[PDB]
């Protein structure tokens, strides 16, 4: 009971960033590492171990 | 002609059974694989044999086909007919073993047993049908008679009708009687199973029994009447290859649904 | 782990002798078992028996004369030898080898028993002068490229100190065998390989044998001896 | 195009496959059972032959039975019950003597019976402590009619009153089982005393029937 | 105290609501679609007699371990399909397996409430139980190696623990959940990890401190599966609601929900591609759906399993996807 209040207060105070900024960072990572991903763009058969 | 309907029904039933086993995920087990092998044998008969017999019907019983091809034709006839007959006998034996003691049947109910059964029935049919190519090709008089082509070997006819339809008939009679006396010791499921077993057994007896008994009476004993009776009954027995794919499957709901979907 | 060889001694030419190696402390069934050193020559691979005895190979020299068998429950490996000649005199080693992805075969060797009666691997220098604390390099070459299509290059480096059995150092030209100091490294190209020792010390002196495991029979190099 | 080491690895894999097949063939022979009873049901006392999970082995007619009892978890069992959907049958043990607990027992039986994963699995129901139930019914201090009004107006299809009470209690569980009507799974009810010479025999007969129904369905007889 | 809780909870709801100035789909609206993605089964791994409950890839990207109802832990060579090891398990009920980042050890867990660590590489050439970790009062749902020494586990006790394998005793315990913890995922930096529970809440956990940093609630029912976005700033959840949700650590709220009216089966597993653009989810509908993580549009389907998919794993290099299922076969997709 009392423990639940204490944890809730600690969770309340946290540095929060804009959702737009978070989405921009996520998109940026996906764009930056898109080329490295084999599943997105199918690899040439020679490069494929499978 | 009425004989052209039977070939159509044979190939239609065996295509429907083959697609129902192959394109359904729930029906793939040992019993349906044995049933698929049976359907394969019935298809091979109804594709390679029955249209040739229809051409014989149309041609006035002079043989248009090559003479040497008749001996291998009789070989294929005896091969596929014996394969079907001992497929049904093995089905009956497996049903009796699975119904009498179901706990002990599931201990050895893998696919290896079904593969061994398929191998055994096909090897038995091949061994029974083995002498027709070897002796029929060397001497043309053993398979020909006044233009018409039929098995002229009397002792071979007796032996291959006693080892192919008088051992399986008594085996099926004994197993049917014991399965009936086993399920009655105990319930609408068991009564439905008894009705299905009785229908299957009596349909098999009605379809196949007259041909072999008149074949025996043809040799052990009026020749035109017996010949005509054999002529009708060998086509009656060909109708059994168009019935076993239906009767052994249509009592299931999944098979009925698959057959309605595919058509 | 231990492999203790038994049998040996004087045998007349044309006689028959059975050599046995007894295994203790390791799962004998899982390991495939194999090697003889002549009195004044490098190692030579005699026979191989797989796990479960499914596969057997022999050297062409001994094929048709020797038979290799394993009795798993007693954890013993046998070599039944017939028609012995003067060339058969050697010290016979019982070796264990396990094959899966990432395994280190030829890791442990037996002590061996004396008996008194094809890819060509070449080592350039029979002897190399060395000093304590000074880096040295050892070179071996292959007649045929040891690089397989799957990417593994099958070269093995063994060290036989004076009066001791060979010890695996490097397997597949780059991997370092367990229990070996980091000083040893294996740099290799197809058809030409080398071993580098940095900060050489005493007790690391001995003959360095290069072996190929690309295909049977397994060929050993003559070896290079190090003396301070 | 395979190296010697790769060939040896393949042979090792084949040996592993052989050993796995042997172990699986050995494992197939046993019939696996699950025992579920919330409390005070005598589920341990059912079988006379013998921390997370408790396992019991008894043999009848040279047939090996495995019975698992999971007692280290809370009342809700939704997650670990997913594992036991390959079992031959589920053995439910309930104390018929305690009438107040019977509604909770019926709810538990309904939850198990209507579980999506256990839809194929058949149930063997052991109504336990029938001797204590009979003693209470003859005493008459406890009234079944108060807990379930239907018993006050009931007729049967050992004293007659005890017989009627036991048939009523059995009828509730049998009706919950019949409500599904699927037929893929059936509830087999039995009445067990505190000490009974044979319960493995009853389980054996029920497992024989359970396997027989699957055999009939597989052979397309049904 | 309860009244004080409501004010702080109401304060949190306002704080996350204020941050939601823009939606993820609004931000990534002008992004080129990935289009249809097609993958085919390159390898089907056979040898497990019974249903497969869990699998895990090795960091070498070639080896994987799998656990099954038959009571065997098998290490496979994915490229050549060979079996490297086959480990007999004391308990046939195994809910999870793990492979060490070094590859020297693997771990196990199940209804026996004990985590067993196995030593793959040893003299005498057989896999032996190095340690059995005891101290959990419920079945172990998941276990993941931080390193060779340390391992985190989640249990049906509603607790997670950090174990020191050498000592064999817990060094930390995480107690925030009100229900059985079904899943956990370790951050790439390893300094923090997430856990999913039947409470239908996901809590960020600090491994070093032993406290809960944040709690995320958007699911109506239990969270079966949890995975961390490759960047580590976000994670994805899977539940029985037939919906997956992407949560952001810094924004402390939901960004996107992956739901389709056609599918009603629960999500058994979730995994991310190397770029993070693709979210792969395993369902009880016997198939896996591939989602555009940014746009939440289904890009493909992986359907080859005759039963439900127990586990889903994407390789470290990202070349292949392995899916296990209750029909006792694992399939490598590319
Ligand atoms: C082996 O049983 C026979 C089966 C048939 C099937 C005819 N459709 C014909 C025979 O004689 C040609 C047989 O041997 C007497």
Question: Features of this protein?
Answer:
heteropentamer, A: 50 residues, mainly alpha, G Protein Gi Gamma 2, 2 helices, 50% helix, E: 334 residues, mainly beta, Methylamine Dehydrogenase, Chain H, four-stranded antiparallel sheet, globular, binds Mescaline, membrane protein, GPCR
Radius of gyration of chain B: 19 Å
For the secondary structure, the number of strands of chain B is 2
Name the helix and strand elements of chain B from N-terminus to C-terminus, one letter apiece: HHHHHHHEEHHHHHH
Number of domains of chain C: 2
WD repeats (chain E): 40-88, 89-134, 135-175, 176-217, 218-261, 262-303, 304-334
GO molecular function (chain E): GTPase activity; GTPase binding; protein-containing complex binding; signaling receptor complex adaptor activity
Protein name (chain E): Guanine nucleotide-binding protein G(I)/G(S)/G(T) subunit beta-1
GO cellular component, one term (chain E): photoreceptor disc membrane
Structure overview:
- The complex is a heteropentamer of chains A (50), B (263), C (228), D (222) and E (334).
- With 263 residues, chain B is mostly helical.
- Chain B has a single domain (3-262), classed as Rhopdopsin 7-helix transmembrane proteins.
- Chain B is built from 13 helices and 2 strands, in the order αααααααββαααααα.
- In chain B, β1 (144-145) and β2 form a beta hairpin.
- In chain B, α2 (30-48) runs parallel beside α6.
- Chain B is globular and about 60 Å long.
- Chain D has a single domain, classed as Rossmann fold (3-Layer(aba) Sandwich), CATH 3.40.50.300.
- Chain D is 41% helix and 18% strand.
- Chain D has a 6-stranded mixed beta sheet, sandwiched between helices.
- Helix content of chain E is 7%, strand content 47%.
- Chain E has helices at 2-19, 24-27; strands at residues 41-45, 52-57, 63-68, 72-77, 83-88, 94-99, 105-110, 115-119, 128-133, 140-145, 150-155, 160-164, 169-174, 181-186, 192-197, 202-206, 212-216, 223-228, 234-239, 243-248, 253-259, 267-272, 278-283, 288-292, 298-302, 311-314, 321-324, 330-333.
- In chain E, the strands form 7 sheets. A 4-stranded antiparallel beta sheet of chain E has the order 1-28-27-26, with no helix packed on it.
- Chains in contact: A-E, B-D, C-D, C-E, D-E.
- The interface between A and E is large, with 36 and 60 residues.
- The complex binds Mescaline.
- Chain A: Keywords: Acetylation, Cell membrane, Host-virus interaction, Lipoprotein, Membrane, Methylation, Prenylation, Transducer.
């Amino acid at each position: 009971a009392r423990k639940l209040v204490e944890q809730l207060k600690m969770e309340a105070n946290i540095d929060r960033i804009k959702v737009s900024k978070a989405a921009a960072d996520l998109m940026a990572y996906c764009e930056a590492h898109a080329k490295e991903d084999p599943l997105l763009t199918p690899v040439p058969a020679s490069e494929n171990p499978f | 002609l009425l004989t052209a309907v039977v070939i159509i029904l044979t190939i239609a039933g065996n295509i429907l059974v083959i697609m129902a086993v192959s394109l359904e995920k729930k029906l793939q087990n040992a019993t349906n694989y044995f049933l698929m092998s049976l359907a394969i044998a019935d298809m091979l008969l109804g594709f390679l044999v029955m249209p040739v017999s229809m051409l014989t019907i149309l041609y006035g019983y002079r043989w248009p086909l090559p003479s040497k091809l008749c001996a291998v034709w009789i070989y294929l006839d005896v091969l596929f007919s014996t394969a079907s007959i001992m497929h049904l006998c093995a089905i009956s034996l497996d049903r009796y073993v699975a119904i009498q003691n179901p706990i002990h049947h599931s201990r050895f109910n893998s696919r290896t047993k079904a593969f061994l059964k398929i191998i055994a029935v096909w090897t038995i049919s091949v061994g029974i049908s083995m002498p027709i190519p070897v002796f029929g090709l060397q001497d043309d008089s053993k398979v020909f008679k006044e233009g018409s082509c039929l098995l002229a070997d009397d002792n071979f006819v007796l032996i291959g009708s006693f080892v192919s339809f008088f051992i399986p008939l008594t085996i099926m009679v004994i197993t049917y009687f014991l399965t009936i006396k086993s399920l009655q010791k105990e319930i609408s499921n068991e009564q439905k199973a008894c009705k299905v077993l009785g229908i299957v057994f009596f349909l098999f007896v009605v379809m196949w029994c007259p041909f072999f008994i008149t074949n025996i009476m043809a040799v052990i004993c009026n020749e035109d009447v017996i010949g005509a009776l054999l002529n009708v009954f060998v086509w009656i027995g060909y109708l059994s290859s168009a019935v076993n794919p239906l009767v052994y499957t249509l009592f299931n709901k999944t098979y009925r649904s698959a057959f309605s979907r595919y058509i | 782990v231990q492999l203790v060889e038994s049998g040996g001694g004087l045998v007349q030419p044309g006689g028959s002798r059975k050599l046995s190696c007894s295994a203790s402390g390791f799962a004998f069934s899982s390991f495939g078992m194999h090697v003889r050193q002549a009195p004044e020559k490098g190692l030579e691979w005699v026979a191989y028996i797989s796990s479960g005895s499914g596969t057997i190979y022999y050297a062409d020299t001994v094929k048709g004369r020797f038979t290799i068998s394993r009795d798993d429950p007693k954890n013993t490996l046998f070599l039944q030898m017939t028609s012995l000649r003067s060339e058969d005199t050697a010290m016979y080693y019982c070796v264990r080898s396990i094959y899966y992805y990432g395994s280190s075969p030829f890791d442990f060797w037996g002590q061996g028993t004396t008996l008194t009666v094809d890819i060509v691997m070449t080592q350039a220098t029979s002897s190399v002068p060395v000093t304590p604390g000074e880096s040295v390099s050892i070179s071996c070459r292959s007649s045929k490229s040891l690089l397989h299509s799957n990417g593994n290059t099958y070269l093995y480096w063994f060290l036989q100190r004076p009066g001791q059995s060979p010890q695996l150092l490097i397997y597949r030209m780059s991997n370092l065998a367990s229990g070996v100091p980091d000083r040893f490294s294996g740099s290799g190209s197809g058809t030409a390989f080398t071993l580098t020792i940095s900060r050489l010390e005493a007790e690391d002196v001995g003959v360095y044998y290069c072996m190929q495991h690309l295909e049977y029979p397994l060929t050993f190099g003559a070896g290079t001896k190090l003396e301070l | 195009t395979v190296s010697a080491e790769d060939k040896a690895a393949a042979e090792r894999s084949k040996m592993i496959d052989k050993n796995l097949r042997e172990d699986g063939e050995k494992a197939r022979r046993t019939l696996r059972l699950l025992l579920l009873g919330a409390d005070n049901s005598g589920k341990s006392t059912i079988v006379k032959q013998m921390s997370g999970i408790f396992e019991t082995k008894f043999q009848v007619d040279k047939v090996n039975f495995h019975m698992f009892d999971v007692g280290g978890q809370r009342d809700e069992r939704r997650k670990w019950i997913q594992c036991f959907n390959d079992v031959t049958a589920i053995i439910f043990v309930v104390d018929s003597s305690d009438y107040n607990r019977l509604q909770e027992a019926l709810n538990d039986f309904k939850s198990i019976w209507n579980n999506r994963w256990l839809r194929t699995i058949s149930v063997i129901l052991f109504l336990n402590k029938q001797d204590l139930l009979a003693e209470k019914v003859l005493a008459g201090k406890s009234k079944i009619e108060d807990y379930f009004p239907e018993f006050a107006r009931y007729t049967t299809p050992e004293d007659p009153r005890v017989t009627r009470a036991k048939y009523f209690i059995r009828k509730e569980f049998v009706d919950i089982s019949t409500a599904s009507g699927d037929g893929r799974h059936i509830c087999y009810p039995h009445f067990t005393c505190a000490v009974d010479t044979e319960n493995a025999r009853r389980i054996f007969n029920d497992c024989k029937d359970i396997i027989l129904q699957m055999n009939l369905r597989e052979y397309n007889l049904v | 105290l309860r009244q004080e809780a409501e004010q702080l909870k109401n304060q949190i709801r306002d704080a996350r609501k204020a941050c939601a100035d823009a939606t993820l789909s609004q931000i990534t609206n002008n992004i080129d679609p990935v289009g249809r993605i097609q993958m085919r089964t390159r390898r089907t791994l056979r040898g497990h007699l019974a249903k497969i409950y869990a699998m895990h890839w090795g960091t070498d990207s070639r080896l994987l371990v799998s656990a099954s109802q038959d009571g065997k832990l098998i290490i496979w060579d994915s490229y050549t399909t060979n079996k490297v090891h086959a480990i007999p398990l004391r308990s046939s009920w195994v809910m999870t397996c793990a492979y060490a980042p070094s590859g020297n050890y693997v771990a196990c867990g199940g209804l026996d409430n004990i985590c067993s660590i196995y030593n793959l590489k040893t003299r005498e050439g057989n896999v032996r139980v190095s340690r059995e970790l005891a101290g959990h009062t419920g079945y172990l749902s998941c276990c993941r190696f931080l390193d060779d020494n340390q391992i985190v586990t989640s249990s049906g006790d509603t607790t997670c623990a950090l174990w020191d394998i050498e000592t064999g005793q817990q060094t930390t315990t995480f107690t925030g959940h009100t229900g059985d913890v079904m899943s956990l995922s370790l951050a790439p930096d390893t300094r923090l990890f997430v856990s999913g529970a039947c409470d239908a809440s996901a809590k960020l956990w600090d491994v070093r401190e032993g406290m809960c940093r944040q709690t995320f609630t958007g699911h109506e029912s239990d969270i079966n599966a949890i995975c961390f976005f490759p960047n580590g700033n976000a994670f994805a959840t899977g539940s029985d609601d037939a919906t997956c949700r992407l949560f952001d650590l810094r924004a402390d709220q939901e960004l996107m929900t992956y739901s389709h009216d056609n599918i009603i089966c629960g999500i058994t597993s979730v995994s991310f591609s190397k770029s993070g653009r693709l979210l792969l989810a395993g369902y009880d509908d016997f198939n896996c759906n591939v989602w555009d993580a940014l746009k939440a549009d289904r890009a493909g389907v992986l359907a080859g399993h005759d039963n439900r998919v127990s586990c889903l794993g994407v390789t470290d290099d990202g070349m292949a996807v392995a899916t296990g299922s209750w029909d006792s076969f694992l399939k490598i997709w590319n």
